[PDB]
Amino acid sequence: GSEHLVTTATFSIGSTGLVVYDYQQLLIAYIPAPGTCCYIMKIAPESIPSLEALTQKVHNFQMECSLQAKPAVPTSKLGQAEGRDAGSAPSGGDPAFLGMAVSTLCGEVPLYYI
């Protein structure tokens, strides 16, 4: 379906880099290089500021990041949750549970949420 995308939430930050803006998903994921770390950005429904501002925050520093070995999946689902696993004590959080857009785009790529 490349001939016709007819898909909303389409944003473009640059020719080499593409930014996925989700107004309904309230989530965002900017993919720099073909196989680099990803970032997550939350936005309100009646909020959602300008993209130019966001880019400034990303370019403000060295997004260049790289993980090694962290708990839970990086950003890819599979099919498991409501099972026997209790999830240890009541604390923590699994960031790898966003939409398929950022989940697939980042695949098995880590994240730090800047």
Automatic annotation (TrEMBL):
Signal peptide: none annotated. Residues 11-114 form the BRICHOS domain. Keywords: Disulfide bond, Gaseous exchange, Lipoprotein, Membrane, Palmitate, Secreted, Surface film, Transmembrane, Transmembrane helix. It comes from Homo sapiens (Human). This is Surfactant protein C. It is found in: Secreted, Extracellular space, Surface film. The keyword Transcription does not apply. Its main location: secreted. One of its GO terms (cellular component) is extracellular region. GO terms for biological process: respiratory gaseous exchange by respiratory system. Pulmonary surfactant associated proteins promote alveolar stability by lowering the surface tension at the air-liquid interface in the peripheral air spaces.
